Design a protein around this ligand. Structure first.
Ligand SMILES: C[C@H](C(=O)SCCNC(=O)CCNC(=O)[C@H](O)C(C)(C)COP(=O)(O)OP(=O)(O)OC[C@@H]1O[C@@H](n2cnc3c(N)ncnc32)[C@H](O)[C@@H]1OP(=O)(O)O)c1cccc(C(=O)c2ccccc2)c1
Ligand SMILES: C[C@H](C(=O)SCCNC(=O)CCNC(=O)[C@H](O)C(C)(C)COP(=O)(O)OP(=O)(O)OC[C@@H]1O[C@@H](n2cnc3c(N)ncnc32)[C@H](O)[C@@H]1OP(=O)(O)O)c1cccc(C(=O)c2ccccc2)c1
Lengths: 354, 354
């Protein structure tokens, strides 16, 4: 198996959202990933796995599972607190059969506290810690950033950092431990820059009035003549100057880049400029530029973008394109993901593993 | 130094955004983090858990001090355009000669090669190219940037972290380091792999504001309350949706079906009128301890008053401002409270200590 995590062994108890995403990235980087689902696969998030079923409520299902776990490095579970305990797959049961196991618990609200038993999804976790309120236009209700910030960014990715930091700690101590990854925590660390900026008077709680939330005319999207969009991210004054020259705009006509009181007016001037040509035109004009102006591509166009094609950021599978592994490694390179490995028998795996 | 990454030694060539966010988290988890800034130069909490040092790397003495640190360290982080470290004398090849155990971590937006590899850019630019930006915001309006959460951090720093830590695990076999190439355009593509999966199997359109998780579903969105503040609704599962309806006072019999997309306009109007009839804190009461997946959308400034946030110590206080505590959490080797940014140190003192 290709990648820096060759021969890492990972047991995944099937769930949704973050736990499966973390398992995927582990797979992607060469880990041996076995996912236990329940007797009751077309999701490419299940790439780079062996799938096995087992009623974990049965006596045998439990016993089989504990044999897997005994032979593994990492266990991932993404159920509400208490769930794995009741199955007899809790951290303490696992530590009897393998004091080396990294026990990885993926929740939204965490392991304890008043909301620990509440159902939730991404939108709920990011609502509570200030993140969701900060996203969208000011004259309007907050908009969910898909499920990128709670499930993945502040979720799976923190589970991963935890699984791999604990594997490092293990090398010097010989012992596993429990990783408690809560989306409400990770997503808060994910947005630490805003907490830093608010502390130094450089971020408000007003939506749509900030450097990076879309309120700044040099950090936003603009509609073009054809109804498609560009993104502008020209924060540094020299990039900003370069953009203005490429728009045909004389800097003397315009309010200061960072006079926030005149942003409305600046925006109107830039709006009229971008509107006068189509997206492709601006993509051309600004190629090789430090003006920080890029075409906003829809998913279906991404496969036609030179920089995407030539770095092979995607590969063709199945119905269509999928992201290749990340990040990239010079010596032990990941390989192209294996499609979801149709259900094998949990005994097979055990023989294969000893 | 507390945390699972105790012992880990890290050199960070000062940059902006992902590079320092990665460095911070390593610090957060116990790593020993030394940051080399240029002398043309702390109230940014993103530079917590650091020793800072000065050094002109353009000078001959600068370079060789730098090169000593690198020799005695496990990890190098740099986030400059490709070719910059080379032309400084700090490239991978030069580093591999004073320390072949080094994890050489390269944080960019566009990657190390290809047509955009020298273009300046920010978060909004990298997510504009891979389909992400286009998918965020309401359907009748231009895309809205999800702050810099998806490119810089979730799809940037966090992949840098996984790469560093995956390579550290690899260096337990081979005894040799390697080059980690983390590009935001790639990492953020893996961050959104779910949408690429659903797109392949007909469960996600390219139409902004018309999907299950982008705000198009009346049961996964925010709603404005009587007081002009908001709640989040994430009631995807039918059981949770039913619980929400009951709390709202709406009879399922009078509403269109939850997933009859063609009648979402009606459904949304009904839910809109219901949520609008009481204030956010009413709904907060009604639904606490419920599985209805309704939470208050708090602003940053109110987060410190939320019981579940307080009790799990998701935040700590520092220098007039709350800041996030490290994530994730570890049962045995817990992280400490982060130390504030430390006034500078002489690069000699550090080489001694090491
Ligand atoms: C955008 C969105 C997301 O945000 S995904 C992230 C959702 N949040 C979390 O994951 C946080 C932690 N987990 C939970 O809070 C719950 O898991 C629950 C999701 C609320 C469901 O609650 P429940 O259904 O009540 O489950 P539970 O955790 O309470 O326990 C159920 C268990 O089932 C039993 N058993 C488990 N394995 C087995 C087995 N092998 N054999 C037999 N039984 C098993 C356990 O014993 C336990 O049962 P109980 O004893 O306690 O009954 C998101 C992201 C991605 C996808 C989705 C979709 O919904 C979706 C759907 C279709 C297409 C695309 C997406 C949503
Ligand atoms: C939301 C937003 C973000 O998205 S942040 C992420 C931006 N993207 C990246 O980071 C990816 C890779 N990097 C770059 O593409 C460039 O770095 C550049 C920043 C575009 C432009 O930088 P340039 O100014 O051209 O620098 P360069 O990297 O090409 O080369 C600079 C070098 O400087 C020299 N030298 C370095 N160290 C030393 C030293 N110790 N002594 C002497 N010289 C040194 C090198 O030699 C080289 O110079 P040259 O030889 O080539 O001249 C974001 C995130 C966070 C913050 C911000 C803010 O802007 C902000 C600002 C204020 C408050 C709050 C936020 C924005």
């Amino acid at each position: 198996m290709a990648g820096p995590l060759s021969g890492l062994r990972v047991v995944e108890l099937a769930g949704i959202g973050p736990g499966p995403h973390a398992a995927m990235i582990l797979g992607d980087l060469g880990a041996d990933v076995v996912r236990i689902d329940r007797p009751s696969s077309r999701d490419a998030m299940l790439r780079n796995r062996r799938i096995v079923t087992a009623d974990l409520k049965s006596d045998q299902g439990l016993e089989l599972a504990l044999k897997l776990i005994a032979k593994a490095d990492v266990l991932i579970e993404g159920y509400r607190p208490g769930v794995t305990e009741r199955l007899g797959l809790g951290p303490e049961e696992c530590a009897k059969v393998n004091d080396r196991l990294i026990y990885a618990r993926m929740t939204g609200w965490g392991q304890t506290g008043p909301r620990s038993q509440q159902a939730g999804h991404d939108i709920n976790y990011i609502s509570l810690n200030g993140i969701l309120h900060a996203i969208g236009r000011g004259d309007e209700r907050p908009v969910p950033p898909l499920n990128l910030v709670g499930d993945f960014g502040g979720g799976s990715m923190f589970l991963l950092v935890g699984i791999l930091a604990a594997l490092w700690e293990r090398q010097s101590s010989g012992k596993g431990q429990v990783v408690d990854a809560a989306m409400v925590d990770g997503s808060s660390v994910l947005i630490q820059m805003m907490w830093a900026m608010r502390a130094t008077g450089m971020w408000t709680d007003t939506r749509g009035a900030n450097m990076l939330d879309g309120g700044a005319p040099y950090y936003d999207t603009y509609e073009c003549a054809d109804g498609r969009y560009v993104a502008v991210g020209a924060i540094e004054p020299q990039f900003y100057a370069a953009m203005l020259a490429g728009l045909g705009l004389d800097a003397a006509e315009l309010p200061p880049q960072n006079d926030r009181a005149r942003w409305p007016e600046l925006r109107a001037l830039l709006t009229e400029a971008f509107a006068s040509h189509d997206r492709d035109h601006w993509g051309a004009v600004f190629a090789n530029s430090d003006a920080c102006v890029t075409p906003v591509l829809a998913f279906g166009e991404v496969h036609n973008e030179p920089h995407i094609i030539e770095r092979n950021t995607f590969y063709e599978a199945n119905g269509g394109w999928q992201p290749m592994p990340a990040p990239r490694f010079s010596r032990t390179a990941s390989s192209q993901p294996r499609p979801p490995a149709a259900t094998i028998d949990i005994e097979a795996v055990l023989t294969d593993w000893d």
